[model samples]
Target: GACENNFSDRECERRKKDCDSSMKFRELSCPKTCGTC
Candidate 1:
């Protein structure tokens, strides 16, 4: 769900907020999409 396409805005933002949470939602490239990007 988070590897092939862009991880949902809800997912990325939540991760970006803390970063530690990204582990549960992302497996590949969830970077850049986290902040203002």
Candidate 2:
């Protein structure tokens, strides 16, 4: 996620936290490397 500092770091941090908390544990990250390896 992209956060802008125009408002404040606190707002950005809060949004990131909320997004993370609302996401499912299993969907947090991809299991496969997707060829990045």
Candidate 3:
């Protein structure tokens, strides 16, 4: 349940596609949104 997103939900959702390639950044930036955490 600690899947807190570093970026705001709206921002994260907007850049959700980035998680596919920008793994390093998205992992921390959009963990919950990207489901990486």
Candidate 4:
């Protein structure tokens, strides 16, 4: 008998997490915590 594999994974969720972390990390801090000269 041949072996079967469960290739089904949450690739979509993985990408979502990756992008959400690097999402303009600066954009979230910049302009928001900038000091006025």
Candidate 5:
């Protein structure tokens, strides 16, 4: 799939660091920001 973030606001960016702490969310919500995409 193409790289993209589910959220459209700053929420994803705010939680950029959370990618490592919260793997599930990062994979589901912030994949693009987390670079998992």
Candidate 6:
């Protein structure tokens, strides 16, 4: 159970980073799509 929890946390972190990077790219490429960011 501990190992599974750690794996889930790692996966969550990776997904969060991916989402942040995608948002950053969108903001840079298409600023109009995401205003006030």
Highest lDDT: give the candidate number.
3
TM-score of 3: 0.61
Cα error, candidate 2, residue 23 (Å)? 16
Instruction: Compose the digit string of candidate 1's lDDT tens values, residues 1-37.
Output: 3333267666666566555565644463465555432
Taking the tens digit of each residue's C-alpha lDDT, what string does model 3 give over 1-37?
A: 6778876898888777768788666655677767876
On lDDT, the stronger of 1 and 4 is 1
Model 5 agreement with the true structure over 1-37: per-residue lDDT tens digits: 8877788637777777757778666655777666766
Runs of candidate 5 with Cα error greater than 4 angstroms are: none
All candidates: CA RMSD in angstroms? 5.9, 10.7, 2.1, 18.8, 2.3, 13.2
Stretches of model 4 off by over 4 angstroms after superposition: 1-9, 18-37
Which rank order by lDDT, best down to worst? Answer: 3, 5, 1, 6, 2, 4
Predicted candidate 6 versus true structure: per-residue lDDT over 1-37, tens digit per residue: 1122223444444444444457544333333222223
After aligning candidate 6 to the native by TM-score, how far in Å is the CA of 27 from where it should be? 24
lDDT of 3 at 1: 65
By TM-score, the best candidate is: 3
Candidate 3 segments exceeding 4 Å error: none
Better of 4 and 5 by lDDT: 5
- What are the clashing pairs of model 4? none
Give one digit per residue, the lDDT tens place, for model 4 in 1-37: 2322122224322333334454453233222212201
lDDT of 4 at 5: 19
TM for candidate 2 is 0.29
* Best-to-worst ranking by TM-score: 3, 5, 1, 2, 6, 4
- Candidate 6 positional error at 10, Å: 0.3
TM-score of each: 0.33, 0.29, 0.61, 0.20, 0.57, 0.24
In terms of lDDT, model 6 sits at 0.37
